[PDB]
RNA sequence: ACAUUUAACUAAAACCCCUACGCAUUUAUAUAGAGGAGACAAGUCGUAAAGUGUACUGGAAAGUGCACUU
């Protein structure tokens, strides 16, 4: 598929990397992804103002993650909402207020997380982790998973 | 560590120590694998309000947010 470049390399960026993000985690524990090469804009008969990026994806044998996706998009998108911030301080939206500081406390003491590590800097396998650990606390709280909050912050 | 013997009616003889250097140290070569730069590719190729920086971007051919310039 061709993307925009700089979604191309967002889609496919290391751990570490300027463009890691969202995409990145979400394409790359399912999929092994290669940005190819990049397009400039002038090769196109309209020319836009970016350039365009190709992009190749292989689905994995054995996923990264063994969860189903929409948990680890929740996961995901908590982790990478403050990407220049340290990543409890996105995982502790997970949780209602009144569980706010006790179950961020447990999450990652059960993952094995260190509280200090950007979101920029958690590879696929601390994603797996936390991953597993939400699962089972929703497991153990039916309503959980369900948590948006932006409406409690409504109210 | 190691030690002054003989000899001396002219004067001479004798002399000989034991201790490594290595999975240490310096530089270089060969090898798996990965990554860069060069030739704007030449054509019997195709055709006719704006700007700058920075931050996020998961409905990104660019947008929005902040600050600036004419
Ligand atoms: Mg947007």
Redesign the pocket.
């Known amino acids: 598929l ?6 191309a390399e ?1 889609l496919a960026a290391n751990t570490g990397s ?2 890691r ?3 990145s ?2 394409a790359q524990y399912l999929c092994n992804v290669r940005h190819i090469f990049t ?1 400039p ?1 002038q090769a ?7 350039d ?1 990026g190709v992009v190749h994806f292989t689905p994995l044998i054995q996923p990264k993650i063994e969860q189903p996706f929409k948990l ?2 929740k996961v ?2 908590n982790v ?2 403050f ?2 911030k340290y990543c409890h301080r996105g995982l502790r939206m997970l949780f209602p207020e009144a569980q706010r500081l006790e179950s961020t406390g447990r999450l990652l003491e059960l993952a094995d997380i260190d509280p200090t590590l950007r ?2 800097q958690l590879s696929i396998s601390h994603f797996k982790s936390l991953c597993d650990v939400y699962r089972k606390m929703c497991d153990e709280d039916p309503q959980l998973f369900a948590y948006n909050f932006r409406e409690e912050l409504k109210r």
């Open positions: 061709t993307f925009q470049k700089e979604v967002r300027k463009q993000s969202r995409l985690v979400m397009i804009g196109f008969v309209p020319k836009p103002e970016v365009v680890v998009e995901v998108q990478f909402q990407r220049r979101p920029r």
